[model samples]
Target: MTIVHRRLALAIGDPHGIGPEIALKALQQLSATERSLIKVYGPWSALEQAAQICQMESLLQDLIHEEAGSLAQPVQCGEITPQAGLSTVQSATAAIRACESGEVDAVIACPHHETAIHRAGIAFSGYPSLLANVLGMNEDEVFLMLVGAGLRIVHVTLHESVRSALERLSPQLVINAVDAAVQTCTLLGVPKPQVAVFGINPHASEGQLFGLEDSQITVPAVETLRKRGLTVDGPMGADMVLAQRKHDLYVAMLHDQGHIPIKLLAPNGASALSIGGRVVLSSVGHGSAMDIAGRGVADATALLRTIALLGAQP
Candidate 1:
């Protein structure tokens, strides 16, 4: 059988962190068949450092540095200086440019330090938001979709504080998230997606005792979606809705609302994952592990699971 290459571009996240190392680990784990399908984009220097650290020098030849369009740069690692931050931004920009130009099919970026990336003067909040901005999308218009065995979760409000997130909650935002989740399921080949939404309040407000957002705002939005001929449920207690096994996906009202359930279920593993169309992308669901940087004790399971999940997905 002929193996078809599925090109993927990676943005080397915070240069001072484990983004490069984990990414290198992920690439090494890919099957020879899978490796043939990938193309990494970012600073060649960072990638080489990661490769060297892992003692996987033989795999270096397989890496294609999209930054130079042809040549690879010298390896540099464990540097979180301002210059490193700038280089990270440059690599991210180059990766995004490749995605835009159709040089790569999808982007599987490493985790970035939100503050560091922003301090370096890169526009937008984080990777997802940055991607949306580069695509010229309104912040409210983009959504994060996480996929796993039989579970899919999409967050209505991402990367905001709990207080500000509550203020930002609106019927339209809830509705839009539902619509995106439904469409995403369809793209994944589901005939009719059964989506359950999480409430904004505890016990779904217990009749407004906790809060009115779930009852007053979220209920109305769920009703609105139903009127459009979709099988949407909830504004149910966040914990309760997720506990049920019947639903296909859960539309979470806030960041932690959605994340907690998945993380709890899949902690320390890639049990919960995210994807874009046929492209499967995964991360540790955690941060850069800066404290443990360069100790060589960092766990590669999360990164390994990400690659495994991507290959497992149909």
Candidate 2:
């Protein structure tokens, strides 16, 4: 018999949160062949505790485990601790390096606890930024694309103040966002993606009546994209364009523009892809449920779907 190396590295995020349990549950839902192609990254102690809680200790034998992010303190379910945060970052970082080194095709990180990560004094915003730092790329080079509920939306700016993000938006930035979207669309099997750009202002400043930023920023960006021979449209209102639901991808100038609809629609099933990096990484659309940690009831739907999303046939 021959052994098949894992193709996907699954990082169990923020062990004290719901990450470990949901990760186990998600694995339990996969077909044997699919399960065989995953290497689980996290502390052995956390995985053990989660397995005992979920009553699937037998599943541990099947995992290709890489011990990263060992907790410094005893596992305290649903509590935010610096130790847990450090472990979260450590495990995810290890999984990312594995993907970068070609040990895996892609990575799916379970939800992380933001507060815990902050408590550790780690400068973090989200996975995309973490990916950028780990891979030594500029933050702008990486983008976040949320996939679920029949729509794919990419954010031009994430985890920033509205005013800060607005000042940061420019023609070049918008172009980069679209380009990243196109690259990821191809990875997900869309050869030529039709993309839509949401205006920075309402109705794209209603042709500069509302604001000149869209005309000055998004308009020229779209022109450049078309000149580059990409099938792109917009500088239109996000609400208007999304209402018609007529594009393969939508570029959001603001975070809420992209996130609101996805969270509303998919809720527990969306997958957030950290795209345009040497290693493609994804996380569940939802957050680490500290409130529900260790309850043995966190829904694995998003994590399972994320695995299926990136666990594409190798």
Candidate 3:
């Protein structure tokens, strides 16, 4: 157990939210075999507070808290304060640096609260976008997808409203999303992943009666992916695809179209992170649910599943 076969860094995000609560549970349940390899990055005080809330502080008595930061103030569980926001950035930076420095093979960051990010005076659409920039990755070259239960979705338009998501989708972008899905699936140990691309309009636009996007944007993109010799199919209706359609992976047109199914169908899922092979990054499926932040009843299922996923990767 002393030998570090693999290392995974868990970054606690949004101190006032459930991020710390879940990490506490994840830390508590970790096997002794992974003890040497799993390290935590975040406010130590937040960890103590979460442990205090869970009344399981004794379980993590020997947990190794990495020297990620000492900058952010100790935060109460449900305060939603600016200091809690600052703590999010501090820990994320340390986790990124730790991964970059070869201290860990992967990172499993807990959910980040959007309001916390804004309060920290940072502008970001989401955590994946924010982290990609920290990793020096081009948004064009990277793909951020969510995986929960039996579902996997690659986002073409992320964190935008339906109208803006459509504004962002082009035939080329759709094709690229498909391409990324194929590559991401390969990393997931499936080479010929059947990628199902969901349609934008009702019934895939009903032959352009409801909308022209299916033909103009989505179908053409599927065709392009087909021409590339990648295993792909779609422009199928969003409704039919998730419930009845079959695929190794899925391509979503807009934010809600993709998020609704995964978050709804699978309450426990991992964060979407694509950048490098050696450093696998993932997170809990859901967000920082502030309403139940300090209730000490937040479920650790997602983060626990995320930890399992991160350790069982290339």
- State the RMSD for candidate 2: 3.3
> lDDT tens digits, residues 1-314, model 1?
22223456666566667877877777776666677666665666666667667787888887665653222334334444545556666666566666667766555566666666556565655555555556666766667776654567888888878999899989998887777667656544464888787888888788789987887778899899999898887778878877777888788888887777666666555333233222233345567667765555566666555544333332
Q: Evaluate residue 155 in candidate 1 and report its C-alpha lDDT on the 0 to 100 scale.
A: 84
| Lowest summed lDDT window (length 10), candidate 2 | 1-10
By summed lDDT, the worst window of 10 consecutive residues in model 3 runs over: 270-279
> Where does candidate 2 clash, by residue pair?
none
On TM-score, the leading prediction is 2
What lDDT tens digits, residue by residue, belong to model 2 across residues 79-163? 8898999999999999999988988877888878888899999999788889999999889778999988889999999888999
lDDT of 3 at 272: 67
| Cα distance off (Å), candidate 2, residue 49 | 1.8
Q: Output the better candidate (1/3) by lDDT.
A: 3
Error of 1 at 48 (Å): 2.9
Residue pairs with colliding backbones in model 3 are 271-283
- Model 1 CA lDDT for position 305: 54
> lDDT for each of the candidates?
0.65, 0.86, 0.73
